[PDB]
Short mmCIF file of C-alpha atoms in Angstrom, two decimals:
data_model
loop_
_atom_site.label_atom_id
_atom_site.label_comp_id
_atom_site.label_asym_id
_atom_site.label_seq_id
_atom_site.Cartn_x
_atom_site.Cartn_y
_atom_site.Cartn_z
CA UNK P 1 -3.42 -8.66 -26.38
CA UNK P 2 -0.63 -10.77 -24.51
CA UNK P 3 1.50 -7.71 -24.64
CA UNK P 4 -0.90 -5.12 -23.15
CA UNK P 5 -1.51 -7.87 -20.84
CA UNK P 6 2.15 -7.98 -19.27
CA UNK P 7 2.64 -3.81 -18.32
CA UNK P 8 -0.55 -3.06 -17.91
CA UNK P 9 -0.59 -6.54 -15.39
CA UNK P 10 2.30 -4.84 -13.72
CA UNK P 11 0.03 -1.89 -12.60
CA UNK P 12 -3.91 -2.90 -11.78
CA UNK P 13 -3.79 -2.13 -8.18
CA UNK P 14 -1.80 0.64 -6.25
CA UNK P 15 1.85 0.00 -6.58
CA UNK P 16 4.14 1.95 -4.09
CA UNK P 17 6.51 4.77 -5.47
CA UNK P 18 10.16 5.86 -4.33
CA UNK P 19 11.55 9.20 -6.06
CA UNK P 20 15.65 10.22 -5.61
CA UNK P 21 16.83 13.30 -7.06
CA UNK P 22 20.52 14.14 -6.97
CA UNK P 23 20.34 18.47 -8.19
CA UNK P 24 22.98 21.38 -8.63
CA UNK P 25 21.93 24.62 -10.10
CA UNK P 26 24.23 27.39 -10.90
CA UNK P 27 26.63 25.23 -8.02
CA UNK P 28 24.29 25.28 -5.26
CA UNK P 29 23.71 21.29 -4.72
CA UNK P 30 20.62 19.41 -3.01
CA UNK P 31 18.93 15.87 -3.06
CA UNK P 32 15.19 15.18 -2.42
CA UNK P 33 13.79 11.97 -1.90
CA UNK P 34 9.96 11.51 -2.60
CA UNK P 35 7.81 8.43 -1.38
CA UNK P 36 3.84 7.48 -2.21
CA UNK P 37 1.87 5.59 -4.53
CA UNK P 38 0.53 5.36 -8.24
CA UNK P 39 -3.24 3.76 -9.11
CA UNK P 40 -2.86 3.61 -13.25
CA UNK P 41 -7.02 1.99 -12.96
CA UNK P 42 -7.13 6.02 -12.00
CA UNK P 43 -4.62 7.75 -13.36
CA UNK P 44 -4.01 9.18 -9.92
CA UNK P 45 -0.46 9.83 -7.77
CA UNK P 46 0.29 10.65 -4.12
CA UNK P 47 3.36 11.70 -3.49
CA UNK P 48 5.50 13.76 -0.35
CA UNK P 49 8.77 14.81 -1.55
CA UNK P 50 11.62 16.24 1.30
CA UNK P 51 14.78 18.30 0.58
CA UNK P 52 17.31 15.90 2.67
CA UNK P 53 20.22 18.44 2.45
CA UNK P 54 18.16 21.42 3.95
CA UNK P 55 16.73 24.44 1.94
CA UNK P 56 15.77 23.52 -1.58
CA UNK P 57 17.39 26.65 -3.87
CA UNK P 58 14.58 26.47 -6.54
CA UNK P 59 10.81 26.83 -6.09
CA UNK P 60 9.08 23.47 -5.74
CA UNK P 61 6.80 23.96 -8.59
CA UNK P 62 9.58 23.91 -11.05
CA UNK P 63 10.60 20.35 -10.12
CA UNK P 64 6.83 18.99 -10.24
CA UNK P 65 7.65 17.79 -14.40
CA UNK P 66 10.62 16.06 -12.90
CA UNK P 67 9.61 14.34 -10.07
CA UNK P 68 6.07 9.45 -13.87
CA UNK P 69 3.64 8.61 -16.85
CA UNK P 70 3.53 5.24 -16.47
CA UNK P 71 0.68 5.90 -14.16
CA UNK P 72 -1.49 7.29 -16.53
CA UNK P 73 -4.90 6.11 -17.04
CA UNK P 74 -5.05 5.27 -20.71
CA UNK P 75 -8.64 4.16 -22.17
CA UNK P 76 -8.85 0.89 -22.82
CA UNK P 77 -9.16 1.83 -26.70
CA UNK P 78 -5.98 3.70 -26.33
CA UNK P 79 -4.06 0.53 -24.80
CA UNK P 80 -1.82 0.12 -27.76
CA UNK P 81 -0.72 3.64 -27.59
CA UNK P 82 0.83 3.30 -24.10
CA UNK P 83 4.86 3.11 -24.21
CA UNK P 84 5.25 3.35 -20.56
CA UNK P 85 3.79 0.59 -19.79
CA UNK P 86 5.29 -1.63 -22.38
CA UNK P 87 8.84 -0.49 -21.53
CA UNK P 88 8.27 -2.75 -17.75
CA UNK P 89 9.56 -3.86 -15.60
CA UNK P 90 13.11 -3.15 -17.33
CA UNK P 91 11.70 0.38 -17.34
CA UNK P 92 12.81 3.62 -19.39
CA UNK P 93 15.17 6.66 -19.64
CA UNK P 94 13.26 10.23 -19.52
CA UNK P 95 15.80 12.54 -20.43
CA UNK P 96 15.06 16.73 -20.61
CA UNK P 97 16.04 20.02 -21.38
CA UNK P 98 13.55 22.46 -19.76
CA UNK P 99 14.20 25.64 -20.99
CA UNK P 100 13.07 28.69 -18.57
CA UNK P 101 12.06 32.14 -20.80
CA UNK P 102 14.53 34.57 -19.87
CA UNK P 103 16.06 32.47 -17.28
CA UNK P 104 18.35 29.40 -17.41
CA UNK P 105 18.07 25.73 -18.00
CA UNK P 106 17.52 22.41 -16.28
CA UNK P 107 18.82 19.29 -18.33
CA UNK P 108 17.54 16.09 -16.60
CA UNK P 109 18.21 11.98 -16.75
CA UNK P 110 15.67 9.52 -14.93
CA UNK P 111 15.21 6.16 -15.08
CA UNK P 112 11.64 4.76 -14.14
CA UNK P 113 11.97 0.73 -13.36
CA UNK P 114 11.03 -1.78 -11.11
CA UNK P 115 12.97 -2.46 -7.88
CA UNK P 116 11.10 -5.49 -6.44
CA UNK P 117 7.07 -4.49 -6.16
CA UNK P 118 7.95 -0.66 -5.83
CA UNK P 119 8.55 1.63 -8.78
CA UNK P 120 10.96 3.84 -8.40
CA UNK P 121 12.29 7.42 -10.40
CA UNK P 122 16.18 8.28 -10.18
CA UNK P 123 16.84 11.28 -11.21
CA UNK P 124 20.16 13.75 -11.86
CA UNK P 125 19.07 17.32 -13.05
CA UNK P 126 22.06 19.47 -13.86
CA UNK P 127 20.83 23.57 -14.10
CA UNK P 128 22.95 26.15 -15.34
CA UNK P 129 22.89 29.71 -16.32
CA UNK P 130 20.03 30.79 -14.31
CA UNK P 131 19.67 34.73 -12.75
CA UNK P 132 20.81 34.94 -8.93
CA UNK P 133 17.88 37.12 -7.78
CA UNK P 134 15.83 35.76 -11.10
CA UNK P 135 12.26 34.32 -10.80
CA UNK P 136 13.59 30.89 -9.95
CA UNK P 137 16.94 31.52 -7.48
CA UNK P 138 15.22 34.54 -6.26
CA UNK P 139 12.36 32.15 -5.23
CA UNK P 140 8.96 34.20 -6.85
CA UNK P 141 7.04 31.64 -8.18
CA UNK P 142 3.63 31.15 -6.35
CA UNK P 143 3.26 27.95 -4.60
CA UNK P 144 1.00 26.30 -7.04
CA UNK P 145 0.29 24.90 -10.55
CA UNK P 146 -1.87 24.93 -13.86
CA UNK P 147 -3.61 21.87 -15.81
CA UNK P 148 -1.51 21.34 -19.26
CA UNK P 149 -1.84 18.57 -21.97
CA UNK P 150 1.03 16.85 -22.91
CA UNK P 151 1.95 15.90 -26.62
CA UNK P 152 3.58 12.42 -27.23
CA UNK P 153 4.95 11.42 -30.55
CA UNK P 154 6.84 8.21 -31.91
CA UNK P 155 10.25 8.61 -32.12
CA UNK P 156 10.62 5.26 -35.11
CA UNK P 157 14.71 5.70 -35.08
CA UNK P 158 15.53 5.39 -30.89
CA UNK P 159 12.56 3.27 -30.46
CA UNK P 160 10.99 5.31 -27.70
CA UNK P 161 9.32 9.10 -27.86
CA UNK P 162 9.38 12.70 -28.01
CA UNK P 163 7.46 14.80 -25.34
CA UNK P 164 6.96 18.25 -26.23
CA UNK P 165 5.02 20.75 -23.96
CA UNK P 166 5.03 24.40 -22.33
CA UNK P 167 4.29 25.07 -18.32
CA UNK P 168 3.15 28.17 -17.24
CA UNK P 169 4.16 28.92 -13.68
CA UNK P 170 2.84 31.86 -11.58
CA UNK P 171 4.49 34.49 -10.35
CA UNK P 172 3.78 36.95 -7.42
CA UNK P 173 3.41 39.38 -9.24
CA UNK P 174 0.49 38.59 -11.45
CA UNK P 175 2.56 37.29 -14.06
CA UNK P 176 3.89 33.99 -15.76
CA UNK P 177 7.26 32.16 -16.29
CA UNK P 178 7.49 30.35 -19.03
CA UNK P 179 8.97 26.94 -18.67
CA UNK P 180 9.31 25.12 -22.38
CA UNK P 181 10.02 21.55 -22.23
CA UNK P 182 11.71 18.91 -24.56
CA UNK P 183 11.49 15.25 -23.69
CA UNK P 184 12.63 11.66 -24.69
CA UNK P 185 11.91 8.88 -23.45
CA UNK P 186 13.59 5.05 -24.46
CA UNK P 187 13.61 2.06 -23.07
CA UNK P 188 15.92 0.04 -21.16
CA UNK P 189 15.62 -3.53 -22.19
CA UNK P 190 16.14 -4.71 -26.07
CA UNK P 191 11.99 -6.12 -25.46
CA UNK P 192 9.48 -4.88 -27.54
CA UNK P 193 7.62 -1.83 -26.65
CA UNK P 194 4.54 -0.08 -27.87
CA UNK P 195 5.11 3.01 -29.96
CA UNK P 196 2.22 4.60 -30.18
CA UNK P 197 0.07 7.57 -32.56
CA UNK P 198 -0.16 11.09 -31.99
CA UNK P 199 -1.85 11.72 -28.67
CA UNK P 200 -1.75 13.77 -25.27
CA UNK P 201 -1.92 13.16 -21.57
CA UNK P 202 -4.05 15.84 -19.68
CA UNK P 203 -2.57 16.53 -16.06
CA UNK P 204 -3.78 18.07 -12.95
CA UNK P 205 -1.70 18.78 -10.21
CA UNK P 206 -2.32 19.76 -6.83
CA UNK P 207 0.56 21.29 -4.76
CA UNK P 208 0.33 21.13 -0.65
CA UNK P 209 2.12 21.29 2.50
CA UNK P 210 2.14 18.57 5.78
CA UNK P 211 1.45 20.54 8.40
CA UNK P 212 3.69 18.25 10.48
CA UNK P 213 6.37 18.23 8.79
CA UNK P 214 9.44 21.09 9.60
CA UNK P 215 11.64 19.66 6.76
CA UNK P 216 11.46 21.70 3.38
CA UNK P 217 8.97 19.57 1.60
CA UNK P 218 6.23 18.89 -1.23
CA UNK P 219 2.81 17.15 -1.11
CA UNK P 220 2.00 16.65 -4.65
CA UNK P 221 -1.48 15.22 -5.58
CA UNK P 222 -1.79 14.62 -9.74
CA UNK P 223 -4.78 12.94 -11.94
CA UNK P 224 -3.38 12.15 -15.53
CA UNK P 225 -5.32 10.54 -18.45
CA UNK P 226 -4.73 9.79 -21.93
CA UNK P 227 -6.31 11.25 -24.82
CA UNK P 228 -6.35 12.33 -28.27
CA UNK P 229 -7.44 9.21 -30.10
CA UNK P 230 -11.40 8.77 -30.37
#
């Protein structure tokens, strides 16, 4: 398929990764900039994010859906279901509202594109209307994170799609916050792009720490694959 040829092309080997988020929640500003590398063959990223303007007001865990699913692995009987892929190099808008139960909400804008041989996530995340001393600006969310399958549909009328999905993060208590998420996704260029069936990605991430590292920071380590379709 000359088309699954092209994207897919674009990503056979290990392609290097730069993230930039620009975030204010409930007025207290920050920026993080991320850097590693995405292996689609695999389905598997390696990232290090840093806060660059000091302390990072939220937990790290709730900007790990934030900080790229053009790297997943899709079967090679799924290739026509892939709109990530088929969206590059122009690349496409993720937009979402990430709704926090019983606490406020983070409304996000990326766009995932090429910038020479590196692929690159800008990000602005706007959250508002969260508790002061909640689970999220009161910082008690455990320093870790769940496996979760992701639901992708067609979205026929803004040629693109619509993510749907709940995380579940810990808290130190025992207990769970609820983090419901609404996504779309459409591309940049007027090309065509694949629009696929009903299906899911399954993710597992892996949250650590560089021990040489004194800024406020994130080691992420994630394995995603697409499913859904025998």
């Amino acid at each position: 398929d000359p088309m699954v040829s092209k994207g897919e092309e674009l990503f056979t080997g290990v392609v290097p990764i730069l993230v930039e988020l620009d975030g204010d929640v409930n007025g207290h500003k920050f920026s993080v900039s991320g850097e590693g590398e995405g292996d689609a063959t695999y389905g598997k990223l390696t990232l290090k994010f840093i806060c660059t303007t000091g302390k990072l007001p939220v937990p790290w865990p709730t900007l790990v859906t934030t900080f790229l699913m053009c790297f997943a692995r899709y079967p090679d009987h799924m290739k026509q279901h892939d709109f990530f892929k088929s969206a590059m190099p122009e690349g496409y808008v993720q937009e979402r509202t990430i709704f926090f139960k019983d606490d406020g909400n983070y409304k996000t804008r990326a766009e995932v594109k090429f910038e020479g041989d590196t692929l690159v996530n800008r990000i602005e995340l706007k959250g508002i209307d969260f508790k002061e001393d909640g689970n999220i600006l009161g910082h008690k969310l455990e320093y870790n994170y769940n496996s979760h399958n992701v639901y992708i549909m067609a979205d026929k009328q803004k040629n693109g799609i619509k993510v749907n999905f709940k995380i579940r993060h810990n808290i130190e208590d025992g207990s769970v916050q609820l983090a419901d998420h609404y996504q779309q996704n459409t591309p940049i260029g007027d090309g065509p792009v694949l629009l696929p069936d009903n299906h899911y990605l399954s993710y597992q991430s892996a949250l650590s720490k560089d021990p040489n590292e004194k800024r406020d920071h994130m080691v992420l380590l994630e394995f995603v694959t697409a499913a859904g379709i025998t």
